[PDB]
PDB file of C-alpha atoms in Angstrom:
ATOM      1  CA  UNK A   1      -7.283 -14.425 -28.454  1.00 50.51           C
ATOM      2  CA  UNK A   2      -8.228 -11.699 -26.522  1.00 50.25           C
ATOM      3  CA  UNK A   3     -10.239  -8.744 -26.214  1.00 53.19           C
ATOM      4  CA  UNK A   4      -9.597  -5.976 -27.924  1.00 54.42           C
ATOM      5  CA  UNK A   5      -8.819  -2.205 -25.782  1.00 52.22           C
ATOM      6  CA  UNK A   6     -11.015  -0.549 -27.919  1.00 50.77           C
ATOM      7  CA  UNK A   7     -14.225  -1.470 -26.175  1.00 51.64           C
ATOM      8  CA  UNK A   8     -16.306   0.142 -23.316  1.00 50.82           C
ATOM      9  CA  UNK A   9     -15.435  -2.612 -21.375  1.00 52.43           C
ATOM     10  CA  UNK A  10     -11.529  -1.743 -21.335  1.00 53.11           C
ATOM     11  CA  UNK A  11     -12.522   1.753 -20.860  1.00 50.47           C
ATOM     12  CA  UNK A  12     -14.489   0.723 -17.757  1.00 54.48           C
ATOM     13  CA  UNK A  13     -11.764  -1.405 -16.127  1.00 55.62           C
ATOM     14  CA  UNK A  14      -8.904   1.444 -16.307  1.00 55.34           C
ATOM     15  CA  UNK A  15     -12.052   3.889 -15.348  1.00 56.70           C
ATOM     16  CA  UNK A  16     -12.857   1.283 -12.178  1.00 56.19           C
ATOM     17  CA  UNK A  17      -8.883   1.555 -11.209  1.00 58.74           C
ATOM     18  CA  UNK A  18      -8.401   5.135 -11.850  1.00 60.12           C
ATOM     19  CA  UNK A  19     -11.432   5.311  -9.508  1.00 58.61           C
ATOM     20  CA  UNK A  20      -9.386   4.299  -6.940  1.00 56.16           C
ATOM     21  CA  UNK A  21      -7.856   6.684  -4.186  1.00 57.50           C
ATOM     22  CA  UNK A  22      -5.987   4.065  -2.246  1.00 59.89           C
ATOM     23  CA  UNK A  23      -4.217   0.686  -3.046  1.00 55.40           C
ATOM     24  CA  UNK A  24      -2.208  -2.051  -1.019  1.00 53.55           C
ATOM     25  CA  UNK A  25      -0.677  -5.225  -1.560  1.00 50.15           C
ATOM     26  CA  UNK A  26       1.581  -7.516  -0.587  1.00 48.72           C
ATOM     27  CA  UNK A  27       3.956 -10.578  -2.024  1.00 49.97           C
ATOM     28  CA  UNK A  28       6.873 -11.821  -3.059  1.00 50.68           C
ATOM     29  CA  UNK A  29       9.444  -9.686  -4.970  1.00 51.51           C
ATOM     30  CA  UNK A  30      12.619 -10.691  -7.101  1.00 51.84           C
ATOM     31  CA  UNK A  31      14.842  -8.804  -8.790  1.00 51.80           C
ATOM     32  CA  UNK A  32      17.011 -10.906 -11.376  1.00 51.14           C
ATOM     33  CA  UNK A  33      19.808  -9.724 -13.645  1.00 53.51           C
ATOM     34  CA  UNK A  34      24.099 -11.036 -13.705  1.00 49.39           C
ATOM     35  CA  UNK A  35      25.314  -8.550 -11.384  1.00 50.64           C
ATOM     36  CA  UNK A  36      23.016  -9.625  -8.681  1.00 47.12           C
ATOM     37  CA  UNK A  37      19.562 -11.868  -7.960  1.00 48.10           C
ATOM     38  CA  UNK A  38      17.711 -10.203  -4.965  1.00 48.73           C
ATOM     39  CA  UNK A  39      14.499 -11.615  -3.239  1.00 48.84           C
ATOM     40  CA  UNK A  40      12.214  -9.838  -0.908  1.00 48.48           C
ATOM     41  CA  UNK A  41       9.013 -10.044   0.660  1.00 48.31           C
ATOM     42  CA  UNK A  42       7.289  -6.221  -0.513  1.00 48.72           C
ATOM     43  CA  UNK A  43       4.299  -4.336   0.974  1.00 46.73           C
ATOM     44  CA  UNK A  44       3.054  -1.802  -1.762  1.00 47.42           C
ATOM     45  CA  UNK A  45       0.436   1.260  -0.857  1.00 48.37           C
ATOM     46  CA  UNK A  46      -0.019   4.423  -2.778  1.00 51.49           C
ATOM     47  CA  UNK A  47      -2.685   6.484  -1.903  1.00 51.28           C
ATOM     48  CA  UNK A  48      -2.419   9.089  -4.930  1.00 52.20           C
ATOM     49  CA  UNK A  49      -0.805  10.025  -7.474  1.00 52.22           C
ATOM     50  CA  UNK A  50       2.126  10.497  -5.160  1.00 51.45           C
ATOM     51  CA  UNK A  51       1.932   9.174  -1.913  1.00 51.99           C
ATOM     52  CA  UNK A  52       2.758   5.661  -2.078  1.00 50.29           C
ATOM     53  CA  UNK A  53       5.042   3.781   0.576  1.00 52.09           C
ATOM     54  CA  UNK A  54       7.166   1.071  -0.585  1.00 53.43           C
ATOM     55  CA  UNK A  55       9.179  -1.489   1.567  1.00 50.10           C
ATOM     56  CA  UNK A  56      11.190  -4.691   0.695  1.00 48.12           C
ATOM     57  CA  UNK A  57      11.733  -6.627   3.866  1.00 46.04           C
ATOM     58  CA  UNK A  58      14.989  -9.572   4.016  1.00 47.03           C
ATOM     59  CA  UNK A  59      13.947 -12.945   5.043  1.00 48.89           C
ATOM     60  CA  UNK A  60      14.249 -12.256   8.686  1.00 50.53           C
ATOM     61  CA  UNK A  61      12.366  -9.716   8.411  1.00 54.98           C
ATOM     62  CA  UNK A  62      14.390  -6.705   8.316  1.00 55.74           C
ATOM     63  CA  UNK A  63      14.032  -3.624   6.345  1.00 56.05           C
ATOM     64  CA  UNK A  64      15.981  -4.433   2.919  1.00 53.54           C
ATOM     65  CA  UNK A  65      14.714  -0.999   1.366  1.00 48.98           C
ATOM     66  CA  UNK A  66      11.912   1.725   2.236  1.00 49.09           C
ATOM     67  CA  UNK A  67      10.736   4.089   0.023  1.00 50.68           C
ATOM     68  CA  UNK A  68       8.024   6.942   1.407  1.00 51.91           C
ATOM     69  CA  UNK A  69       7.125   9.700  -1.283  1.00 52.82           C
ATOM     70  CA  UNK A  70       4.834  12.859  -0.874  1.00 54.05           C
ATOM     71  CA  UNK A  71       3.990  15.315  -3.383  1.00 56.45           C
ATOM     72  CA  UNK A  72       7.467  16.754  -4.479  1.00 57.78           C
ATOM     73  CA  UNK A  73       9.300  15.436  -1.849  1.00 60.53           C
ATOM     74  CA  UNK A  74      11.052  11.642  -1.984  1.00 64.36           C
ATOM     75  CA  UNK A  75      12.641   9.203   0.920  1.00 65.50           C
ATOM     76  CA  UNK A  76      15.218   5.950   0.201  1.00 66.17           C
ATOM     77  CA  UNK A  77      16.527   3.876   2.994  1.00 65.65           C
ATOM     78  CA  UNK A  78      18.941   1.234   2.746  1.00 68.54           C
ATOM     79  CA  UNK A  79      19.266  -2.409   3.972  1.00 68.21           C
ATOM     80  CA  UNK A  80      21.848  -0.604   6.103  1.00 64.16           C
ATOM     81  CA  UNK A  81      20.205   2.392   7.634  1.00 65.73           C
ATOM     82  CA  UNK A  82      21.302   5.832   4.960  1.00 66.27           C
ATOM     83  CA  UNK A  83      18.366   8.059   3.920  1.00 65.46           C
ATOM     84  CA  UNK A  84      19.104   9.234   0.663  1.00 67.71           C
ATOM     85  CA  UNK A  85      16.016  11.786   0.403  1.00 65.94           C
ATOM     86  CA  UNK A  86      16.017  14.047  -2.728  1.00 68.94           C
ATOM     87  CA  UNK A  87      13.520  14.724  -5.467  1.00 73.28           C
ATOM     88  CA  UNK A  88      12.962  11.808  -8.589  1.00 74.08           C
ATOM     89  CA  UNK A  89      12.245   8.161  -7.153  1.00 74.71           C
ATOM     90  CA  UNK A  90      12.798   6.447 -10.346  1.00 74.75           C
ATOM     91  CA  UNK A  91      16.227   7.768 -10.559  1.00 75.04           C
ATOM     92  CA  UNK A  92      17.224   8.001  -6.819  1.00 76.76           C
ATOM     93  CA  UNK A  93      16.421   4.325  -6.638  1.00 80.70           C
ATOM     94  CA  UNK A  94      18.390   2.290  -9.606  1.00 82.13           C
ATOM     95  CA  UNK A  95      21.154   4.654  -8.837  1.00 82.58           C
ATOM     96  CA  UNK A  96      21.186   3.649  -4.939  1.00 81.43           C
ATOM     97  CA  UNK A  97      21.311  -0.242  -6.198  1.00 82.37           C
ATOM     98  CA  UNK A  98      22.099  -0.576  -9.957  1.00 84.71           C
ATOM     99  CA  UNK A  99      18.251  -1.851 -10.128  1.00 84.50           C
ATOM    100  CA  UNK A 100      17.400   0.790 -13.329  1.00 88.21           C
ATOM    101  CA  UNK A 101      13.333   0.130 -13.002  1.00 86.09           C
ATOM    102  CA  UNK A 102      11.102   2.562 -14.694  1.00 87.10           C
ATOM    103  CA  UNK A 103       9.465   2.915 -11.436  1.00 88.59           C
ATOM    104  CA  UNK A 104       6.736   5.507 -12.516  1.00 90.01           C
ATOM    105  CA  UNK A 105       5.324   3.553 -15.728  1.00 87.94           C
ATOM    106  CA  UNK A 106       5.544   0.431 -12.985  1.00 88.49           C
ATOM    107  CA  UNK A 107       3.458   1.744 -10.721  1.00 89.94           C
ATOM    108  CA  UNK A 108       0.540   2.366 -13.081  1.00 85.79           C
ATOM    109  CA  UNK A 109       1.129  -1.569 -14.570  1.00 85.85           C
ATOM    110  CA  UNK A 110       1.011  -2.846 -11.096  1.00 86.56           C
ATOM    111  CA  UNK A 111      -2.948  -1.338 -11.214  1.00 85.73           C
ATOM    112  CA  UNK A 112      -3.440  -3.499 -14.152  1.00 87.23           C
ATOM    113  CA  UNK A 113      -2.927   0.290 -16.184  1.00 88.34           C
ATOM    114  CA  UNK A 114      -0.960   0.615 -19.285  1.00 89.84           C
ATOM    115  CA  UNK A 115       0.197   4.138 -18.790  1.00 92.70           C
ATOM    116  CA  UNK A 116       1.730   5.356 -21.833  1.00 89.19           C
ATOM    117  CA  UNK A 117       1.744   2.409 -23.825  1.00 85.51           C
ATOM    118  CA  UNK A 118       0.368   2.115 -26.823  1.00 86.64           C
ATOM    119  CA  UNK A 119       1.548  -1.477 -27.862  1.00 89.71           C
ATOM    120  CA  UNK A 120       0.302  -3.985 -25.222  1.00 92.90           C
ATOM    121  CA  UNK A 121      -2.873  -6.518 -25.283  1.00 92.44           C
ATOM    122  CA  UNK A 122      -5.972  -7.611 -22.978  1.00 91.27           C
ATOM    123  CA  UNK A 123      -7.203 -11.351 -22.072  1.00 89.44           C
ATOM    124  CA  UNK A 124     -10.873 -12.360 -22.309  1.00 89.49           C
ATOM    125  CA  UNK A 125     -12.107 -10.273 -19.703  1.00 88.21           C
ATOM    126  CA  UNK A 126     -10.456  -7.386 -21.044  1.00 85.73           C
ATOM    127  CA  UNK A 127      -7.955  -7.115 -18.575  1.00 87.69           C
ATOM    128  CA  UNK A 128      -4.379  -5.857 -19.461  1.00 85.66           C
ATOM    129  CA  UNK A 129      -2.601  -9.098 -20.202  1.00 85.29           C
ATOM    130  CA  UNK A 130       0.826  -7.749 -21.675  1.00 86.07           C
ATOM    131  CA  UNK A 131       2.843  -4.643 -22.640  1.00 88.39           C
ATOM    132  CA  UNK A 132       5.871  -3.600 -24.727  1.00 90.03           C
ATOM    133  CA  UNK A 133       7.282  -0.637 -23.764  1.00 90.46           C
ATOM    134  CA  UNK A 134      10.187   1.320 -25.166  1.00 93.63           C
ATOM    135  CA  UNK A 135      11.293   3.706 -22.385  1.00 95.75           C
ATOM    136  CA  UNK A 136      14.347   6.224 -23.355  1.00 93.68           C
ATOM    137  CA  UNK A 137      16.216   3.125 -24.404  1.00 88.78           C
ATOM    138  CA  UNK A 138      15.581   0.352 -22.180  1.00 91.21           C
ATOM    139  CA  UNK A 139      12.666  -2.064 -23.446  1.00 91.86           C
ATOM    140  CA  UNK A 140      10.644  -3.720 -20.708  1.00 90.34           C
ATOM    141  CA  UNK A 141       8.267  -6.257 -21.623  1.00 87.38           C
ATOM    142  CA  UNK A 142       5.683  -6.883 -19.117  1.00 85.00           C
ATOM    143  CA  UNK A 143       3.524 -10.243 -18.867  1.00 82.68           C
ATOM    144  CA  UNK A 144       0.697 -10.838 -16.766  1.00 83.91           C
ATOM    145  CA  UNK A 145      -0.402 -13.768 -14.890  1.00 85.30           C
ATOM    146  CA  UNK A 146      -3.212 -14.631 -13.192  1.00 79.86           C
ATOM    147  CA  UNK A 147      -5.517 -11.515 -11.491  1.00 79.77           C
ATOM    148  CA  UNK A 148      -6.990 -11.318  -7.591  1.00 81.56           C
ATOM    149  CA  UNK A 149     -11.059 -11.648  -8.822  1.00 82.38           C
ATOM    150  CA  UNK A 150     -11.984 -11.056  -5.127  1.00 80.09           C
ATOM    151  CA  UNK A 151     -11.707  -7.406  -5.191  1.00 82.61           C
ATOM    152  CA  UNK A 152     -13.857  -4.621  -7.278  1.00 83.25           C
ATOM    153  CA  UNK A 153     -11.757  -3.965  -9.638  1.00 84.60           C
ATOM    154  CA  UNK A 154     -10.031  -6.990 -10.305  1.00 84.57           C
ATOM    155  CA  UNK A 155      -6.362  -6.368  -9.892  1.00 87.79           C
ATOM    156  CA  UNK A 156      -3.135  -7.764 -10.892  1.00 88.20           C
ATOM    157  CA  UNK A 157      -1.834 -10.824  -8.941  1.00 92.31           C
ATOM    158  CA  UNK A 158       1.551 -12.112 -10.996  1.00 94.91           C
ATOM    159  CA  UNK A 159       3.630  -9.862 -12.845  1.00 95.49           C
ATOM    160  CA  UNK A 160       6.955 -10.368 -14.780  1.00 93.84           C
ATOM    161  CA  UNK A 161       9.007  -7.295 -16.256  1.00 95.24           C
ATOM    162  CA  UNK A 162      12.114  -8.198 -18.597  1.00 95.57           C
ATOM    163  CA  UNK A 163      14.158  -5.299 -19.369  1.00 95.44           C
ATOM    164  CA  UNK A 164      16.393  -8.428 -21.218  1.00 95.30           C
ATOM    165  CA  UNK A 165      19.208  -7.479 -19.220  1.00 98.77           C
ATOM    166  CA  UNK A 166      16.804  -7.665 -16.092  1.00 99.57           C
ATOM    167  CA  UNK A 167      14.197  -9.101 -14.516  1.00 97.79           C
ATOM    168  CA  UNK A 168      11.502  -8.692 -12.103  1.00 97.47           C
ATOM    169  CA  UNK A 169       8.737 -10.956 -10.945  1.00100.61           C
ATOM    170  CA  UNK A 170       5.828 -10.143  -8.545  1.00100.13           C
ATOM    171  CA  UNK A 171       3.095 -12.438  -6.845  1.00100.29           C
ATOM    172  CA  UNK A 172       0.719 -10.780  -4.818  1.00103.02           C
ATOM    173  CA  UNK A 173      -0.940 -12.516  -2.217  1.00100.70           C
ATOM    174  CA  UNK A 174      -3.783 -10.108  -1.701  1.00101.32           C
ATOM    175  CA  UNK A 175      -5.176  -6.512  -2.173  1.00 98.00           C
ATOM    176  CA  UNK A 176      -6.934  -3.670  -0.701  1.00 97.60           C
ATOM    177  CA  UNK A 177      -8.700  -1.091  -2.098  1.00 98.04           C
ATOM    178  CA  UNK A 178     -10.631   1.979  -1.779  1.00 99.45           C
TER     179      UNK A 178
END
């Protein structure tokens, strides 16, 4: 079934994330798709609208990708060692590795947000449970798993993006938040 996102409830989760000033988690990552099929282990933190760090490590433990943003300005490094600083994030990072995510709607579904979406559906405690989103072409469908109930909000703890020619799974182990 579901609840439905016209409620107060629904209104009060996204309120209760929005709330938020900072975030942080941390699980496994996995990026699917023919050309390639990368795994990671990925620490997450955004503290604002824009100034969230992002970092896939390799199994020994070495930096596979790093990704520090500030208002307006935008830092890549490589599993090799190149900064490719510049401006856009979501574009300076499936261009750097073929990985075409639509990093800035991603980071609001990783809050248990829906962004822009208007076509996506809640589970019995009017959580966001799944999205369909049409972005300039590519459609992702994201599904939701099971969510971390030991923090205040209640956020997302398994995620699973499907661009059809892609894929991306998420399991977080924990969360902070303030």
């Amino acid at each position: 079934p579901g609840k439905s996102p016209d409620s107060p409830q629904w209104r009060q989760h996204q309120q209760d994330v929005r709330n938020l000033n900072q975030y942080q988690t941390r699980g496994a990552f996995a990026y699917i798709s023919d050309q390639q099929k990368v795994y990671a282990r990925f620490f997450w933190q955004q503290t604002g609208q824009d100034r969230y760090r992002l970092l896939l490590t390799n199994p020994d433990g070495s930096t596979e990708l790093e990704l520090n943003a500030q208002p307006g300005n935008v830092q890549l490094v490589d599993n090799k060692g190149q900064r490719y600083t510049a401006d856009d994030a979501e574009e300076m990072i499936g261009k750097l590795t073929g990985m075409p995510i639509p990093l800035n709607s991603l980071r609001q579904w990783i809050l248990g947000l829906p962004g822009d979406a208007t076509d996506y559906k809640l589970d019995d405690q009017y959580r966001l449970s799944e999205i369909t989103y049409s972005q300039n072409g590519k459609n992702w469908k994201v599904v939701y798993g099971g969510y971390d109930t030991k923090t205040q909000p209640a956020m997302p703890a398994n995620m699973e993006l499907t661009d059809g020619g892609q894929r991306i799974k998420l399991k977080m182990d924990n969360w902070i938040v303030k």
